[PDB]
Amino acid sequence: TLRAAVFDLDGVLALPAVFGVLGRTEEALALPRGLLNDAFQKGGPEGATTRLMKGEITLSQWIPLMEENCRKCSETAKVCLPKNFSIKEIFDKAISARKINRPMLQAALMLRKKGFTTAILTNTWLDDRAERDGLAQLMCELKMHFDFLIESCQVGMVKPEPQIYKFLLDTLKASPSEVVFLDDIGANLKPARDLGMVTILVQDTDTALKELEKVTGIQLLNTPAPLPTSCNPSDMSHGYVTVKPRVRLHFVELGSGPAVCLCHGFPESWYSWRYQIPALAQAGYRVLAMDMKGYGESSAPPEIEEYCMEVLCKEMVTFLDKLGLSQAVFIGHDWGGMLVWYMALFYPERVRAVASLNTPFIPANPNMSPLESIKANPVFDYQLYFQEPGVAEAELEQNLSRTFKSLFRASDESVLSMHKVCEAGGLFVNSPEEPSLSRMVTEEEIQFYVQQFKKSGFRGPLNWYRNMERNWKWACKSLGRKILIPALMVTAEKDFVLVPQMSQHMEDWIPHLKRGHIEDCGHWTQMDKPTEVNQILIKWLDSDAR
Amino acid sequence: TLRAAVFDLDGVLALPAVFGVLGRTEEALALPRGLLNDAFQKGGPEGATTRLMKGEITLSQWIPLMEENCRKCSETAKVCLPKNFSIKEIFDKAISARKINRPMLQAALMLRKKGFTTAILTNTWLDDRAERDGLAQLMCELKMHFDFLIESCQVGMVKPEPQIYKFLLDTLKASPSEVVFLDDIGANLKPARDLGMVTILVQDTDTALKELEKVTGIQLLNTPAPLPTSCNPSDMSHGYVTVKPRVRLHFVELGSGPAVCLCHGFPESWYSWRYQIPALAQAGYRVLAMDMKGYGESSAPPEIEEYCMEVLCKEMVTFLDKLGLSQAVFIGHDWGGMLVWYMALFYPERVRAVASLNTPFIPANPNMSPLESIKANPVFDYQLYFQEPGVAEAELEQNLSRTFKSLFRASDESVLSMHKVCEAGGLFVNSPEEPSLSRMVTEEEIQFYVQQFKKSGFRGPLNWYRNMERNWKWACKSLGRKILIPALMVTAEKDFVLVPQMSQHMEDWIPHLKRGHIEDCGHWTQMDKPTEVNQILIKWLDSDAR
Numbered sequence A, B: 001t002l003r004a005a006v007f008d009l010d011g012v013l014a015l016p017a018v019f020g021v022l023g024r025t026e027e028a029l030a031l032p033r034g035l036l037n038d039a040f041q042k043g044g045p046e047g048a049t050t051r052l053m054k055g056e057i058t059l060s061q062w063i064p065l066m067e068e069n070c071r072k073c074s075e076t077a078k079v080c081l082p083k084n085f086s087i088k089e090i091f092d093k094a095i096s097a098r099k100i101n102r103p104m105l106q107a108a109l110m111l112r113k114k115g116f117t118t119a120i121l122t123n124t125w126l127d128d129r130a131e132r133d134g135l136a137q138l139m140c141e142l143k144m145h146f147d148f149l150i151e152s153c154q155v156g157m158v159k160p161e162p163q164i165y166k167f168l169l170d171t172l173k174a175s176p177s178e179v180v181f182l183d184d185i186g187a188n189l190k191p192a193r194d195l196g197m198v199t200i201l202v203q204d205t206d207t208a209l210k211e212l213e214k215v216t217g218i219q220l221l222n223t224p225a226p227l228p229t230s231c232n233p234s235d236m237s238h239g240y241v242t243v244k245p246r247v248r249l250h251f252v253e254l255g256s257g258p259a260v261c262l263c264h265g266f267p268e269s270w271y272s273w274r275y276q277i278p279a280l281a282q283a284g285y286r287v288l289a290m291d292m293k294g295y296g297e298s299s300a301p302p303e304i305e306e307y308c309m310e311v312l313c314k315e316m317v318t319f320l321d322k323l324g325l326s327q328a329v330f331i332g333h334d335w336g337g338m339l340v341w342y343m344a345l346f347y348p349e350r351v352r353a354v355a356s357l358n359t360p361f362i363p364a365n366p367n368m369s370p371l372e373s374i375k376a377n378p379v380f381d382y383q384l385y386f387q388e389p390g391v392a393e394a395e396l397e398q399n400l401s402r403t404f405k406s407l408f409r410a411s412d413e414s415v416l417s418m419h420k421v422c423e424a425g426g427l428f429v430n431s432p433e434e435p436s437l438s439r440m441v442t443e444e445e446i447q448f449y450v451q452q453f454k455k456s457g458f459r460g461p462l463n464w465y466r467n468m469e470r471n472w473k474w475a476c477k478s479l480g481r482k483i484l485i486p487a488l489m490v491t492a493e494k495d496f497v498l499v500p501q502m503s504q505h506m507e508d509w510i511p512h513l514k515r516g517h518i519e520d521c522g523h524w525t526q527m528d529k530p531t532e533v534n535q536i537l538i539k540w541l542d543s544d545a546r
């Protein structure tokens, strides 16, 4: 029956309500109870506050009208306002104190996910204060999670006028009885109730959510912890930079603040960072999530040596040159992790800080060919299978959906070992035709990867593994250096290839290294433990890169 | 005969030379003359400094080797180093003091423009200091102006070893006698001279440039002031954001720091900002230069109302939402200028600061239809011609090259008046078939616009003028507001349509308005007076938007 959910902002989606601050301010300054709420509301539908809420004047123009109203309420009440009474000061503090009320937001999210149309309906203002950015961020953060945001100052109408409710029903393309509306103000519910909407008077959050869960029949309270926000590819800003004449790099870009360049591994995509991108942007960074060379919408030339670490690094440098970035933070996973360490080694001046998920930094051994070194570890046998051009391509492109569904699995869901792949003659020889869907990924997400890899397949991606000797020779030039810029190594407990112990000597080469560690996390770290990744990165960025 | 020009960095392209700082430091601290230059150079080809310059160790690893060398030189000289002697401190100060030597850079530029291949050859280091970004910026700024930058620490070789010169001749694909090389160190010229290169020992800049002008036969000294750096479209990062399902916006993106969104007028392009984009990026901003809706690589739907100011503003807001920007600085010219004022009026919270070139802010007259208002000014007659769908399209698309060559002209070069266009029956009725090339633009630049407008022609662009009534109605909602965020108005003296006096009452509506004014500047402000525009914007940004 209920198909729409509408949330007030002040006192419902954002807390403390700013009305509650007029309460406290009165008491703090020992004024008459309600004097500040009277001056606020003076003149009703024709008073300063209604003109503000309808968008007729800006917040800076209203401030001095509210001052006047305070002089007038105080005179008629026979008190005096304190010396240094400041309306600007009180509202600056009140607006900056209000935050997103997390459990209401997650209830709105969850209803959106069970198919509800959702909106925010709020009486708000055109904010032109020096400090307006604070509110602009808050509204951006809430708004990406709703179908609509209706603002009184944008539509020229206010709660509780009956016209804004009709504009609501009309925006939602629904009838009064298919809508629930939560607001902390009884007067605003009054007209929604008249048209026959379910309403919930919002006092404490939990009681409201209990009423909401009862009326919608969907569980909202005590729900398990939700995943971080993901990205819809077609909602993103897509960037293209030609780094040399046959080669363009594609990236997805979100946020402002210090540049953070995310570098995925094999065989992945910018999209492997889908759970990090909104969180890092929201934490105050400019995220640039790459399609690395060979992948997705970046170019994929066929030659093996277009993919040695040297050319790849030089090209990531050019990428920064053309974008006008003197530095970025480099964060990599798997092959990306390898590349960011070498960015730190050869271009420290372009690298603000470096982090790797799973991939340790282990200096080249100048007295052993890197092929022998790879033979010394049975878990790396899949790299030998990758060597011969064509063979792995034929297997991995033969069935894309099967390929990614087999690969992208949590640590208890495995359907292949990395074990004597050469001898068995294939990566998938004894694995299912139609693997079951891992709990980590939806069918839709697999199909995004499948669609990416239809552009260029696995040649360019496998070539990252076909420059052992050339990479070894380059790396040997760096064997006198140390990494002395800020650096983070994150190990994954149940990565059975890139195991945590392989990182154990890293401090010899990176004496100030910081570490995170994630338990119960396989190889696909970002989508296995997104919440934990987000927390470790954001904390390390705020302390080391900011 | 000479086909290549090679510039040293320290003491040639950047000044003061850091070698000169060892001089001063010795005197400042009253040490033995040359003690600091001896410790620096200790051990020759096998000493700490050569390993640094070849890239074997990083700058942070060398610092304490130089300390040791200072202890050793001081002991053998029988002096003591001051308490608080700090190698890090001295080099931090010396590196931050060195700047681009402007006249050498402009000589290199000019030689590049007369067809020379140019490079920087420098002994430099892998800089991993906390403060490394300072140097990274400098190198980025120089490097975009040369064919090559060869760094000793990247190639594993140093001046004056003869191997780096061979690597030079080889990178330049030229023979020893087709090359001039300037360096402040005689020893480095010595081997270039042996292979038969022209060399110039660089002491004071002017004497060197005189020698360079003599040997190349190109005038370099006392040249007229050069234009600011322009943009090559295929060297830029190109951004795409879908703001609703039929509509994507394209932009070109350069720089980091606060977001600055540039909004061109009719009938133009992101490229109309080509002279502002590198300067604003270099000044510390993140520039986003739009193709506005209707143009270039942005979508151009056919319907007139897709182009009213309201829809356009809402869509620029969505553009910020998807990019993750809570604010940007909005800078507009002509129609763009109009749009940014309305951004300031209706979305102050998303606008960090607003500037307009030429377009004044003049509030809608609620008692006069805007068509009558347009009839009241004979210089706006071209807007009436624009009204009827098809008529202006047919004229302006008929010959693109003629169209832009006729339009894009300096104030003394006019070939059309905006005067009784309707009566004459065309904008170009009495103008040349093949206009001469204005001094403002090259043939190549016109052809860029021509190629842009082949994608969608003039429908979407003209539609910006076909919403007079709808724009008027929207604007009337704002007639109680003021613009109280930081705002700049720049007038152009010889814009005969958007004349400076039309801006004269702006302070009534924008009481804190700042102003620039550009003399001898027609309608095409950015390309008419780029140097002056850059200076007025950058100064206003640094004081009001930063």
Ligand SMILES: Nc1ncc(Cc2ccc(Br)cc2)s1
Residues within 6 Å of the ligand: A266, A267, A382, A407, A418, A427, A495, A496, A497, A498, A523
């Ligand atoms: N646990 C793991 N560590 C590393 C892995 C890399 C890998 C990815 C794809 C193919 Br096909 C084979 C191996 S999987």
Ligand SMILES: Nc1ncc(Cc2ccc(Br)cc2)s1
Residues within 6 Å of the ligand: B266, B267, B382, B407, B418, B427, B495, B496, B497, B498, B523
């Ligand atoms: N001096 C000027 N002010 C405004 C101008 C706008 C304009 C641009 C293109 C065509 Br076609 C006609 C007029 S030209």
Ligand SMILES: [Mg+2]
Residues within 6 Å of the ligand: A008, A009, A010, A011, A012, A017, A183, A184, A185
């Ligand atoms: Mg409320």
Ligand SMILES: [Mg+2]
Residues within 6 Å of the ligand: B008, B009, B010, B011, B012, B017, B183, B184, B185
């Ligand atoms: Mg020098």
